[PDB]
Design a protein around this motif. Structure first.
Motif, PDB file in Angstrom:
ATOM      1  N   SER B 116     -13.454  -3.282   2.771  1.00 17.77           N
ATOM      2  CA  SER B 116     -12.704  -4.232   1.945  1.00 17.77           C
ATOM      3  C   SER B 116     -12.040  -3.552   0.752  1.00 17.77           C
ATOM      4  O   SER B 116     -12.039  -4.095  -0.372  1.00 17.77           O
ATOM      5  CB  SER B 116     -13.523  -5.439   1.509  1.00 17.77           C
ATOM      6  OG  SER B 116     -14.262  -5.103   0.380  1.00 17.77           O
ATOM      7  N   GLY B 117     -11.444  -2.380   1.030  1.00 16.79           N
ATOM      8  CA  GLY B 117     -10.456  -1.782   0.146  1.00 16.79           C
ATOM      9  C   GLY B 117      -9.337  -2.738  -0.296  1.00 16.79           C
ATOM     10  O   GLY B 117      -9.293  -3.931   0.065  1.00 16.79           O
ATOM     11  N   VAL B 118      -8.422  -2.206  -1.099  1.00 18.84           N
ATOM     12  CA  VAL B 118      -7.208  -2.930  -1.387  1.00 18.84           C
ATOM     13  C   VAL B 118      -6.419  -3.003  -0.091  1.00 18.84           C
ATOM     14  O   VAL B 118      -5.856  -4.048   0.194  1.00 18.84           O
ATOM     15  CB  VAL B 118      -6.426  -2.354  -2.614  1.00 18.84           C
ATOM     16  CG1 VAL B 118      -4.898  -2.528  -2.487  1.00 18.84           C
ATOM     17  CG2 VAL B 118      -6.908  -3.007  -3.874  1.00 18.84           C
ATOM     18  N   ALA B 161      -9.245   4.042  -9.615  1.00 22.00           N
ATOM     19  CA  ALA B 161      -7.869   4.092 -10.093  1.00 22.00           C
ATOM     20  C   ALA B 161      -7.790   3.409 -11.461  1.00 22.00           C
ATOM     21  O   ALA B 161      -8.582   2.476 -11.726  1.00 22.00           O
ATOM     22  CB  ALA B 161      -6.974   3.425  -9.123  1.00 22.00           C
ATOM     23  N   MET B 162      -6.882   3.890 -12.333  1.00 20.59           N
ATOM     24  CA  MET B 162      -6.678   3.268 -13.673  1.00 20.59           C
ATOM     25  C   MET B 162      -5.215   3.183 -14.104  1.00 20.59           C
ATOM     26  O   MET B 162      -4.893   2.497 -15.075  1.00 20.59           O
ATOM     27  CB  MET B 162      -7.478   3.975 -14.763  1.00 20.59           C
ATOM     28  CG  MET B 162      -6.827   5.280 -15.171  1.00 20.59           C
ATOM     29  SD  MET B 162      -7.977   6.572 -15.717  1.00 20.59           S
ATOM     30  CE  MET B 162      -6.999   8.044 -15.411  1.00 20.59           C
ATOM     31  N   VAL B 163      -4.331   3.865 -13.391  1.00 24.94           N
ATOM     32  CA  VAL B 163      -2.927   3.866 -13.783  1.00 24.94           C
ATOM     33  C   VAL B 163      -2.087   3.079 -12.797  1.00 24.94           C
ATOM     34  O   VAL B 163      -2.289   3.209 -11.579  1.00 24.94           O
ATOM     35  CB  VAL B 163      -2.370   5.309 -13.832  1.00 24.94           C
ATOM     36  CG1 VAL B 163      -0.840   5.318 -13.843  1.00 24.94           C
ATOM     37  CG2 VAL B 163      -2.921   6.046 -15.009  1.00 24.94           C
ATOM     38  N   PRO B 585     -21.100   8.272  -0.226  1.00 21.32           N
ATOM     39  CA  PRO B 585     -21.032   8.213   1.226  1.00 21.32           C
ATOM     40  C   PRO B 585     -19.892   7.339   1.793  1.00 21.32           C
ATOM     41  O   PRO B 585     -19.499   7.585   2.945  1.00 21.32           O
ATOM     42  CB  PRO B 585     -22.394   7.632   1.601  1.00 21.32           C
ATOM     43  CG  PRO B 585     -22.718   6.802   0.474  1.00 21.32           C
ATOM     44  CD  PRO B 585     -22.353   7.674  -0.693  1.00 21.32           C
ATOM     45  N   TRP B 586     -19.383   6.368   1.012  1.00 21.81           N
ATOM     46  CA  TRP B 586     -18.317   5.481   1.467  1.00 21.81           C
ATOM     47  C   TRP B 586     -16.918   5.847   0.929  1.00 21.81           C
ATOM     48  O   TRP B 586     -16.000   4.980   0.824  1.00 21.81           O
ATOM     49  CB  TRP B 586     -18.627   4.049   1.085  1.00 21.81           C
ATOM     50  CG  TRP B 586     -20.048   3.662   1.160  1.00 21.81           C
ATOM     51  CD1 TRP B 586     -20.799   3.157   0.147  1.00 21.81           C
ATOM     52  CD2 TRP B 586     -20.899   3.691   2.312  1.00 21.81           C
ATOM     53  NE1 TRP B 586     -22.069   2.883   0.582  1.00 21.81           N
ATOM     54  CE2 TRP B 586     -22.159   3.195   1.910  1.00 21.81           C
ATOM     55  CE3 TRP B 586     -20.720   4.079   3.647  1.00 21.81           C
ATOM     56  CZ2 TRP B 586     -23.237   3.082   2.790  1.00 21.81           C
ATOM     57  CZ3 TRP B 586     -21.806   3.975   4.526  1.00 21.81           C
ATOM     58  CH2 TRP B 586     -23.047   3.483   4.088  1.00 21.81           C
ATOM     59  N   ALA B 587     -16.761   7.122   0.572  1.00 23.40           N
ATOM     60  CA  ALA B 587     -15.504   7.660   0.069  1.00 23.40           C
ATOM     61  C   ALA B 587     -15.411   9.112   0.494  1.00 23.40           C
ATOM     62  O   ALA B 587     -14.532   9.486   1.259  1.00 23.40           O
ATOM     63  CB  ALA B 587     -15.447   7.540  -1.424  1.00 23.40           C
TER      64      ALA B 587
HETATM   65  C1  LIG Z   1     -11.062   8.050  -6.593  1.00 25.65           C
HETATM   66  C2  LIG Z   1      -9.831   7.796  -7.424  1.00 25.65           C
HETATM   67  C3  LIG Z   1      -9.931   7.937  -8.789  1.00 25.65           C
HETATM   68  C4  LIG Z   1     -11.248   8.327  -9.403  1.00 25.65           C
HETATM   69  C5  LIG Z   1      -8.817   7.720  -9.580  1.00 25.65           C
HETATM   70  C6  LIG Z   1      -7.585   7.371  -9.031  1.00 25.65           C
HETATM   71  C7  LIG Z   1      -7.452   7.185  -7.648  1.00 25.65           C
HETATM   72  C8  LIG Z   1      -8.598   7.433  -6.860  1.00 25.65           C
HETATM   73  N1  LIG Z   1      -6.166   6.861  -7.053  1.00 25.65           N
HETATM   74  C9  LIG Z   1      -6.214   6.390  -5.633  1.00 25.65           C
HETATM   75  C10 LIG Z   1      -6.646   4.952  -5.290  1.00 25.65           C
HETATM   76  O1  LIG Z   1      -7.817   4.621  -6.036  1.00 25.65           O
HETATM   77  C11 LIG Z   1      -6.891   4.836  -3.773  1.00 25.65           C
HETATM   78  O2  LIG Z   1      -5.828   5.460  -3.041  1.00 25.65           O
HETATM   79  C12 LIG Z   1      -6.991   3.431  -3.199  1.00 25.65           C
HETATM   80  O3  LIG Z   1      -7.866   2.622  -4.002  1.00 25.65           O
HETATM   81  C13 LIG Z   1      -7.436   3.538  -1.715  1.00 25.65           C
HETATM   82  O4  LIG Z   1      -7.620   2.257  -1.065  1.00 25.65           O
HETATM   83  P1  LIG Z   1      -8.032   2.033   0.488  1.00 25.65           P
HETATM   84  O5  LIG Z   1      -7.143   2.812   1.455  1.00 25.65           O
HETATM   85  O6  LIG Z   1      -8.188   0.508   0.623  1.00 25.65           O
HETATM   86  O7  LIG Z   1      -9.469   2.750   0.642  1.00 25.65           O
HETATM   87  P2  LIG Z   1     -10.788   2.212  -0.116  1.00 25.65           P
HETATM   88  O8  LIG Z   1     -10.401   1.335  -1.314  1.00 25.65           O
HETATM   89  O9  LIG Z   1     -11.711   3.428  -0.209  1.00 25.65           O
HETATM   90  O10 LIG Z   1     -11.490   1.181   0.900  1.00 25.65           O
HETATM   91  C14 LIG Z   1     -12.315   1.710   1.942  1.00 25.65           C
HETATM   92  C15 LIG Z   1     -13.479   0.761   2.002  1.00 25.65           C
HETATM   93  O11 LIG Z   1     -14.209   1.000   3.179  1.00 25.65           O
HETATM   94  C16 LIG Z   1     -15.594   0.872   2.885  1.00 25.65           C
HETATM   95  N2  LIG Z   1     -16.365   1.583   3.944  1.00 25.65           N
HETATM   96  C17 LIG Z   1     -16.409   2.918   4.171  1.00 25.65           C
HETATM   97  N3  LIG Z   1     -17.208   3.160   5.239  1.00 25.65           N
HETATM   98  C18 LIG Z   1     -17.638   1.968   5.678  1.00 25.65           C
HETATM   99  C19 LIG Z   1     -17.107   0.971   4.872  1.00 25.65           C
HETATM  100  N4  LIG Z   1     -17.370  -0.336   5.084  1.00 25.65           N
HETATM  101  C20 LIG Z   1     -18.223  -0.757   6.182  1.00 25.65           C
HETATM  102  N5  LIG Z   1     -18.748   0.362   6.992  1.00 25.65           N
HETATM  103  C21 LIG Z   1     -18.461   1.647   6.720  1.00 25.65           C
HETATM  104  N6  LIG Z   1     -18.961   2.651   7.454  1.00 25.65           N
HETATM  105  C22 LIG Z   1     -15.691   1.504   1.510  1.00 25.65           C
HETATM  106  O12 LIG Z   1     -16.901   1.202   0.809  1.00 25.65           O
HETATM  107  C23 LIG Z   1     -14.434   0.949   0.848  1.00 25.65           C
HETATM  108  O13 LIG Z   1     -14.616  -0.340   0.237  1.00 25.65           O
HETATM  109  C24 LIG Z   1      -5.293   6.143  -7.910  1.00 25.65           C
HETATM  110  N7  LIG Z   1      -4.291   5.346  -7.462  1.00 25.65           N
HETATM  111  C25 LIG Z   1      -3.473   4.686  -8.330  1.00 25.65           C
HETATM  112  O14 LIG Z   1      -2.526   3.840  -7.849  1.00 25.65           O
HETATM  113  N8  LIG Z   1      -3.580   4.834  -9.684  1.00 25.65           N
HETATM  114  C26 LIG Z   1      -4.531   5.613 -10.251  1.00 25.65           C
HETATM  115  O15 LIG Z   1      -4.627   5.776 -11.599  1.00 25.65           O
HETATM  116  C27 LIG Z   1      -5.357   6.444  -9.355  1.00 25.65           C
HETATM  117  N9  LIG Z   1      -6.526   7.114  -9.947  1.00 25.65           N
HETATM  118  C28 LIG Z   1      -6.043   8.227 -10.815  1.00 25.65           C
HETATM  119  O16 LIG Z   1      -6.527   8.347 -11.961  1.00 25.65           O
HETATM  120  C29 LIG Z   1      -4.930   9.176 -10.418  1.00 25.65           C
HETATM  121  C30 LIG Z   1      -4.489   8.914  -8.996  1.00 25.65           C
HETATM  122  C31 LIG Z   1      -2.997   8.736  -8.824  1.00 25.65           C
HETATM  123  C32 LIG Z   1      -2.417   9.432  -7.758  1.00 25.65           C
HETATM  124  C33 LIG Z   1      -1.059   9.337  -7.506  1.00 25.65           C
HETATM  125  C34 LIG Z   1      -0.278   8.532  -8.337  1.00 25.65           C
HETATM  126 BR1  LIG Z   1       1.577   8.437  -7.943  1.00 25.65          BR
HETATM  127  C35 LIG Z   1      -0.847   7.815  -9.404  1.00 25.65           C
HETATM  128  C36 LIG Z   1      -2.215   7.913  -9.649  1.00 25.65           C
END
Ligand SMILES: [C]C1=C([C])[C]=C2C(=[C]1)N([C][C]([O])[C]([O])[C]([O])[C]OP([O])(=O)OP([O])(=O)O[C][C]1O[C](N3[C]=NC4=C3N=[C]N=C4[N])[C]([O])[C]1[O])C1=NC(=O)[N]C(=O)C1=N2C(=O)[C][C]C1=[C][C]=C(Br)[C]=[C]1
Lengths: 133, 666
Positions: B116-118, B161-163, B585-587
């Motif tokens: 359930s990333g963006v 992420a912050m920008v 582990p999930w990145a």
């Molecule tokens: C790490 C980082 C930091 C510390 C900072 C930052 C960043 C990073 N960047 C980037 C962002 O954050 C990214 O690309 C996004 O958020 C991605 O999204 P996606 O494709 O949706 O992926 P994710 O969220 O990781 O989601 C995935 C999910 O999946 C889950 N899993 C795993 N495995 C599994 C699961 N589930 C069930 N089963 C299994 N096996 C996980 O847990 C998750 O939830 C950024 N970006 C932006 O826009 N801004 C900012 O500020 C940022 N940051 C910084 O500071 C720098 C960087 C940049 C670059 C380039 C440009 Br033009 C601007 C900025």
């Protein structure tokens, strides 16, 4: 188009620094050194030259002989003619020198002399004696 | 630009041209007359504008026809095709609108979405609105994945992420109207401070920086003009290129000094010749004056040969004095012409120790921005995503970026604490086997029409596999996975009871002592209401620093902070957090980058859906079953929130097309 103004990079130059891992720091040491090896040679010649400046010490001031300031003249004295004839034996065709030596005769009068008296002073003979040296 | 063309731009589209993707939905138009093309183009732009000007409520085919004008609102078969295309592919009605036409009575098809990333969230919302049954499986006990936001008391800081990178053509612009984000601009003024804690002065600062930019240009020249892209089979990294450029800038600085001093000897060697001829002149002159004196003894009246001698030596002498005078003339000139050369030499060094340390901070910033050591970036390709840069100035999310996923998440079927373990995709459908992250022997089985995978590339890369594909992904996919790069970058969150930095300044950098440590705590951010400072660990440091304890880190930190602001301006911090994305582990990293030996084309490989073979042999070739979205699947907007969000819009389109058909392409 071209490397950002200033920045230096040319085809051959680049193949040179990449040929192996340390061609990098090789071509940079062969130059670092060619630099000291020329900086040294300067400081050497600098000292050679600073010795010679001691020899030319005081210039040639005490050996100058005052100016022969004297005007020209139309008549050949027997004196002048003899001085002339010898100058020719010793200076050949340097009408300038001959002039200075005789003193009051222009570089022209001299060349004129060369033709008029050429007859009686065997100036041919005198010149070829100078040539034979 | 603005108006109806304002919209096309603000939607990453050319206002006066049909895209590749339009050509496929509307082949009848684009192969047709220059005349209709403009009608299509106008309808499109106007519809976009209509959406853009009010993206807080759904935009219907009804309301669209309504607000078009003749001649354009004549052909309603067309305006329909267009509104439909834009709806399907997520250019209009995306994010969090108010819905006019209520939700389809019974749903069609079933999609299991992993993560359930963006990207996932964005896809899920789309399909749900398109009338499909969606469920998301998320390993974590929260949503937003790489959009994490520390919250506690009043402290708010993103370790994800912050920008936001500029509103000009960013989808987030639309989103920021829909959701409560406090966007605040980042004032790009960044003071540097040397290892000792003494501020680096404007003279240096500006001159080092521009050398940096000049160095980058340089590398671009090596690539496109001099074709320096492969060095005995190994493909050239940006680091390799940068070194080769710096080397050449030294090699020139030297080449200069040589043919400068080499230009001095050549002069001294003249002065030497002169003084020799000049000595042997004194010699003769001395030795003649003698003879003249001797021949001047012979008292007048002399005979003429004796007169001649006196007269003649007096010439010979003054004659040689004229010479020696002119050699004293030359001598004088040669001797000023050495005060010339000795006075202005060329430059002593390419860069001082202290310079090549500031230049490092600049290289650190560049590693920070690509999440990786510059020695891993591909020379030819590292910045292919360049021409798509949004306009407007960068921003931060004062109240924490999570506010976005949390809002997309609203109304979606999400299973938290569910770690997918195996994906099975066959001719008749898919089954997905997850487990409970809390107690892991407890098992789950989800059966569906299609699987949309938003697993981070770090995760897809793991050995041995964290998720299992049955049958395995084809070698053309797995090679795209080896080849692509997945970098890393950490944050340290420092929470204080008082401000003690410059309140009006958003960031300031610390200049490490070595190249090796240029990434370490090199840059601090002042972003939030409460007294929080936020420091980055980038490049080669980022990965190393994960194996060092929080206390030690927060230490090295405070130190650096005392070294700048004075040893007792800086209290102990009330709260601290230290990200470890490579360990998570999930990145398993932070975001991708174009590794040496890859190319942006691998991102296209990442996104192509997979079509399982037949069950019964010689049964017809099916439907595709397994789809891909995420930051690593969008060639033109990698490594970003907006870029993920779009990839998710993309798949929802492509999935709908497949399963609900495409009415608008006829
Ligand atoms: C790490 C980082 C930091 C510390 C900072 C930052 C960043 C990073 N960047 C980037 C962002 O954050 C990214 O690309 C996004 O958020 C991605 O999204 P996606 O494709 O949706 O992926 P994710 O969220 O990781 O989601 C995935 C999910 O999946 C889950 N899993 C795993 N495995 C599994 C699961 N589930 C069930 N089963 C299994 N096996 C996980 O847990 C998750 O939830 C950024 N970006 C932006 O826009 N801004 C900012 O500020 C940022 N940051 C910084 O500071 C720098 C960087 C940049 C670059 C380039 C440009 Br033009 C601007 C900025």
């Amino acid at each position: 188009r071209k490397p950002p103004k200033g920045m230096f990079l040319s085809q051959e130059d680049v193949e040179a620094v990449s040929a192996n891992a340390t061609a990098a720091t090789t071509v940079l040491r062969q130059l670092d050194m060619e630099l000291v090896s020329v900086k040294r040679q300067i400081q050497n010649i600098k000292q050679t030259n600073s010795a010679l400046k001691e020899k030319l010490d005081g210039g040639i001031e005490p050996y100058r002989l005052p100016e022969v300031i004297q005007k020209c003249n139309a008549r050949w004295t027997t004196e002048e003619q003899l001085l002339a004839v010898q100058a020719i034996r010793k200076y050949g065709r340097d009408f300038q020198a001959i002039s200075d030596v005789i003193g009051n005769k222009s570089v022209v009068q001299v060349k004129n002399f060369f033709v008029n008296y050429r007859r009686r002073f065997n100036i041919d003979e005198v010149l070829q004696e100078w040539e034979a040296e | 630009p603005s108006g109806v063309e304002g919209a096309a731009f603000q939607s990453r589209l050319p206002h006066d041209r049909m895209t590749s993707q339009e050509a496929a939905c509307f082949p009848d138009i684009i192969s047709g007359p220059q005349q209709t093309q403009k009608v299509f183009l106008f309808i499109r732009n106007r519809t976009l504008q209509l959406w853009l000007d009010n993206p807080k409520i759904q935009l219907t085919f009804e309301a669209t026809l309504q607000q078009l004008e003749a001649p354009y609102n004549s052909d309603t078969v067309l305006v329909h095709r267009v509104h439909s295309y834009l709806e399907r592919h997520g250019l209009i009605n995306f994010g969090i609108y108010k819905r006019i036409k209520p939700l389809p009575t019974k749903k069609t098809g079933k999609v299991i979405i992993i993560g359930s990333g963006v990207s996932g969230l964005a896809a899920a919302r789309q399909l749900q609105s398109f009338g499909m049954d969606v469920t998301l499986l998320e390993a974590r006990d929260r949503v937003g994945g790489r959009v994490a936001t520390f919250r506690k008391g009043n402290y708010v800081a993103d370790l994800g992420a912050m920008v936001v990178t500029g509103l000009g053509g960013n989808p987030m612009a639309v989103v920021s109207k829909q959701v409560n984000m406090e966007l605040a601009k980042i004032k790009q003024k960044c003071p540097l401070y040397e290892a000792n804690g003494q501020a680096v002065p404007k003279e240096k600062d500006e001159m080092v920086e521009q050398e940096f930019n000049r160095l980058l240009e340089a590398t671009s020249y090596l690539s496109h003009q001099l074709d320096f892209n492969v060095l005995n089979n190994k493909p050239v990294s940006l680091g390799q290129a940068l070194e080769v450029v710096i080397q050449l800038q030294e090699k020139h600085v030297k080449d200069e000094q040589i043919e400068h001093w080499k230009k001095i000897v050549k002069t001294q060697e003249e002065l030497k010749e002169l003084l020799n001829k000049m000595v042997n002149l004194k010699e003769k002159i001395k030795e003649l004056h003698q003879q003249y004196k001797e021949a001047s003894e012979v008292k007048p009246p002399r005979d003429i040969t004796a007169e001649f001698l006196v007269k003649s030596k007096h010439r010979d002498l003054t004659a040689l004095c004229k010479e020696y005078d002119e050699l004293a003339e030359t001598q004088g000139k040669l001797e000023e012409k050495l005060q010339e050369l000795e006075a202005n030499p060329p430059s002593d060094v390419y860069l001082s120790s202290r310079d090549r340390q500031i230049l490092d901070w600049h290289f650190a910033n560049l590693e920070f921005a690509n999440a990786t050591p510059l020695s891993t970036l591909s020379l030819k390709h590292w910045d292919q995503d360049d021409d798509f840069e949004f306009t407007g100035s960068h921003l931060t999310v004062r109240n924490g970026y999570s506010c976005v996923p949390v809002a997309l998440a609203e109304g979606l079927d999400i299973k938290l604490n569910t770690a997918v373990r195996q994906v099975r995709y066959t001719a008749s459908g898919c089954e997905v086997i997850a487990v409970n992250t809390r107690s892991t022997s407890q098992t789950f089985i989800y059966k569906c029409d299609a699987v949309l995978c938003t697993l981070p590339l770090g995760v897809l890369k793991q050995q041995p596999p964290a998720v299992q594909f049955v049958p395995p992904l084809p070698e053309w996919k797995t090679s795209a996975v080896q080849r692509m790069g997945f970098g890393n970058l950490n944050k340290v969150v420092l929470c204080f009871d008082r401000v003690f930095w410059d309140p009006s300044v958003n960031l300031f950098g610390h200049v490490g002592s070595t190249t090796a440590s240029r990434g370490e705590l090199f840059l601090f951010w002042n972003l939030y209401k409460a007294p929080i400072l936020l420091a980055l660990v980038a490049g080669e440091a980022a990965g190393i620093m994960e194996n060092i304890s929080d206390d030690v880190i927060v230490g090295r930190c405070l130190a650096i902070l005392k070294g700048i602001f004075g040893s007792s301006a800086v209290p102990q911090p009330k709260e601290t957090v230290v990200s470890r994305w490579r360990a998570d582990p999930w990145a398993r990293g932070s975001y991708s980058y174009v590794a040496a030996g890859s190319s942006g084309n691998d991102y296209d490989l990442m996104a192509q859906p997979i079509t399982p073979g037949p069950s019964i042999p010689g049964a017809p070739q099916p439907i595709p079953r397994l789809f891909f979205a995420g930051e690593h699947t969008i060639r033109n907007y990698p490594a970003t929130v907006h870029g993920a969000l779009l990839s998710g819009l993309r798949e929802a389109g492509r999935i709908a097309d497949q399963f609900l058909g495409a009415m608008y392409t006829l």
